[PDB]
């Protein structure tokens, strides 16, 4: 309960500056890249092989995997500066803006802006602009330049709304067989964004575009973490509301998806991260 | 000191059985595939990106990375049968045979045999024959069966010899700048196999062929582990002989290669595994 994760819009200029600086150091040290690889590798780890479930997405472990992922990143941040915490991008309130690109998360001081059409949508403003920040591809080879392309897709022209989130919070079951894309009456699947998708989480990924639009390259953009903090916040609120309702499958699902299964690439199980406050943090709104 | 790793050739029939049995259970549970993936994932993790060093190969971490790999695997074995331990394949003595494919390590009771050239070198005997043991490809999807093609290659027609091993043990430096394929006068690089390559570890991979011949799929073949147990034994012997030589680089090598850097995909450092007795095991030759 001690460490607090705040809304990006509640951050002081100094907090924003320290968050960015710390990410740059993690990047320079070689630590950041381990995060990009972990997520891509988990992306190709199928449970079981032959199915479209993977260790980190399209399945029940989606939520505890990204929560373990964010936890480990935050400790890495804290090992550089013990006061830094992971903030969250509350995209549903940015959804209300006539032009979400004008949200303060996109200023030079922070995430930097949308891609520049003149430069094939390479990001050329902020701390992560090309020349300042290097990217890798799916093979783990250098790839020269962060790209973004807000709302350029007919499948994801807008950010999700507060109503979408509210609507997800009403669902009663964590998850339902067969624990995948096609799971219905499923909070997990609704949040991930496959029900009549792309919605919510999935929708944000494709709204941003650039490297964020595809699983293997998505954490090349530091906003990935800010997005996933918000997702983890939503799940936490859902856990607060539906206090009785627990994780499913508790057993008999695909290995890696059950309550006490190792989540590749780690030994951590969903049980280990089921209650976030036990992990040392709460979100400000708590 | 208190768990012993034995030469495969010294195993009893009931020891052979229990090892094979345990691996099959790891496979069935979903545990075994985590190791295939771990190894493939590390192979794609370049230190630094751009270079041809990676987290598990072609660099100083090659040896401790595989030691940690094996340790985890063994613990997973022991969680099924706390009496089971990783045996090793002493390929240098198999090399003495006019034809190494007749070795008992390829018996139907253990690793099974060479590939069937009628079926594109699919292994069709032993516990791991096609239809008893499903394989995965580089993308994580089923690939339809173990393949082996012993010594079918010009570059690797033979197993490495006892003399090859002895000559690697003469080298004084653990490794040398720039900590990769081109490193000279380097125990690491020599044992790995890039000095007039493929020698030693690398030559073994290519001599077996099939999935063993390629980085992303090599661990599909359980002999991968018996192979690396021999590699780990050879390193441990080098560490005994040169008791005052330590891991290199200590610092200013690429991140992930230094003595106290985490080895992707773990937080484990080379220092964490530099003393194998501290890890709880010993090779039978030490006794
Ligand atoms: N694959 C998701 C989008 C997505 C992209 C990157 C991720 O890490 C996760 C999800 C979709 O089909 O809509
Ligand atoms: N790359 C080695 C062969 C090899 C195959 C699989 C491995 O895991 C490791 C090495 C060579 O070129 O000789
Ligand atoms: Zn995501
Ligand atoms: Zn993802
Ligand atoms: Zn190898
Ligand atoms: Zn290998």
């Amino acid at each position: 309960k001690y460490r607090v994760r705040k809304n990006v819009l509640h951050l002081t200029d100094t907090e924003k500056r320290d968050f960015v600086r710390t990410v740059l150091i993690l990047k320079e040290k070689g630590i950041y890249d381990r995060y990009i690889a972990w997520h891509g590798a988990a992306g190709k780890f199928h449970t079981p092989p032959g199915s479209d479930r993977n260790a980190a997405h399209m399945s029940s472990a989606f939520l505890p995997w990204h929560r373990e992922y964010l936890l480990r990143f935050e400790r890495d941040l804290q090992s550089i500066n013990p006061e830094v915490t992971l903030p969250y991008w509350e995209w549903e309130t940015d959804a209300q803006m006539q032009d979400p690109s004008q949200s303060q998360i996109w200023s030079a001081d922070f995430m930097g802006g949308n891609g520049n059409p003149i430069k094939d949508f390479i990001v050329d403003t902020g701390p992560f602009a090309a020349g300042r920040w290097t990217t890798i591809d799916e093979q783990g080879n250098p790839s020269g330049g962060l790209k973004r392309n807000f709302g350029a897709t007919k499948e994801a022209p807008t950010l999700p709304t507060r109503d979408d989130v509210l609507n997800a919070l009403k669902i009663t079951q964590y998850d339902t067989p067969p624990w995948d894309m096609t799971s219905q009456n499923s909070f997990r699947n609704q949040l991930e964004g496959f029900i009549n998708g792309p919605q919510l989480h999935n929708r944000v990924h494709r709204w941003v575009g650039g490297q964020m639009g595809v699983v293997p390259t998505a954490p090349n953009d530091p906003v990935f973490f800010l997005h996933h903090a918000n997702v983890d916040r939503i799940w936490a609120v859902w856990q607060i509301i539906h206090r009785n309702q627990n994780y499913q499958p508790m057993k008999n699902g695909p290995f890696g998806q059950n309550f006490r299964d190792p989540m590749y690439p780690w030994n951590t199980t969903p049980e280990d991260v089921m209650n976030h406050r036990k992990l040392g943090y709460v979100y400000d709104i708590e």
Side-chain angles (χ1 to χ4, degrees), chain A:
Chain A
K1 321 95 153 51
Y2 270 3
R3 289 330 267 111
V4 52
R5 287 145 76 137
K6 314 193 198 165
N7 190 314
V8 163
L9 297 188
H10 291 176
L11 294 171
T12 64
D13 298 328
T14 304
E15 278 171 307
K16 292 171 176 178
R17 165 189 313 141
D18 287 338
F19 175 79
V20 157
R21 210 95 147 186
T22 300
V23 169
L24 293 167
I25 296 159
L26 239 39
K27 178 72 144 89
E28 192 172 308
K29 286 181 169 299
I31 288 167
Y32 193 96
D33 285 333
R34 285 162 48 88
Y35 286 87
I36 302 175
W38 269 342
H39 170 263
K44 293 169 54 212
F45 190 89
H46 308 280
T47 67
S51 86
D52 54 12
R53 313 197 184 74
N54 60 80
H57 315 84
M58 302 169 190
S59 75
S60 312
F62 168 60
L63 295 178
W65 195 103
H66 287 76
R67 179 180 285 174
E68 169 69 6
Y69 186 78
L70 292 177
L71 187 53
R72 286 166 103 100
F73 188 70
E74 187 176 54
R75 287 157 171 162
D76 276 345
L77 299 171
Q78 281 163 7
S79 78
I80 307 301
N81 186 322
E83 303 299 305
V84 173
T85 58
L86 227 210
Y88 60 89
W89 175 28
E90 197 181 44
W91 25 256
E92 55 272 44
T93 65
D94 273 13
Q96 290 166 357
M97 299 176 66
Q98 170 65 243
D99 182 15
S101 84
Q102 305 305 279
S103 155
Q104 209 63 24
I105 190 180
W106 308 114
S107 45
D109 74 327
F110 218 34
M111 285 304 101
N114 188 3
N116 185 359
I118 301 309
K119 306 151 154 80
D120 311 335
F121 304 95
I122 289 283
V123 167
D124 66 346
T125 59
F128 307 118
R132 304 202 265 274
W133 176 264
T134 63
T135 50
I136 61 186
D137 57 29
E138 332 207 342
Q139 293 177 335
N141 307 308
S143 51
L146 215 219
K147 294 194 182 176
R148 294 161 177 161
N149 201 346
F150 300 170
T153 260
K154 293 167 294 171
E155 294 77 23
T158 62
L159 291 169
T161 69
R162 182 180 292 172
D163 285 344
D164 298 344
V165 176
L166 253 21
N167 277 338
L169 288 170
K170 300 170 185 180
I171 301 141
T172 304
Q173 299 291 89
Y174 174 79
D175 215 347
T176 53
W179 331 101
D180 67 5
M181 272 191 60
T182 69
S183 282
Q184 303 290 300
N185 280 92
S186 177
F187 174 66
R188 189 278 303 162
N189 210 40
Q190 260 264 276
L191 223 197
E192 192 169 359
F194 287 107
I195 308 293
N196 279 84
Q199 303 301 337
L200 292 156
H201 161 268
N202 290 349
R203 186 170 277 245
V204 169
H205 271 288
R206 25 223 304 183
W207 186 87
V208 173
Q211 283 93 346
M212 272 263 67
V214 303
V215 174
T217 56
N220 280 282
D221 193 335
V223 82
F224 179 104
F225 299 90
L226 263 35
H227 175 22
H228 270 276
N230 204 43
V231 169
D232 186 69
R233 183 186 55 84
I234 306 315
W235 177 27
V237 168
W238 182 94
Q239 297 188 279
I240 296 303
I241 295 169
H242 311 263
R243 201 209 344 284
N244 219 8
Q245 216 64 225
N246 214 268
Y247 181 93
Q248 299 174 66
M250 288 287 307
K251 52 181 168 60
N252 298 332
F255 186 74
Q257 304 292 335
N258 302 293
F259 192 57
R260 299 183 191 263
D261 285 346
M263 290 182 305
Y264 183 87
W266 315 289
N267 287 346
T268 318
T269 75
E271 176 180 39
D272 290 333
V273 299
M274 201 47 58
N275 186 254
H276 72 294
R277 294 176 185 166
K278 235 95 160 310
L279 305 184
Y281 70 97
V282 294
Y283 292 91
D284 60 359
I285 46 115
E286 277 169 279

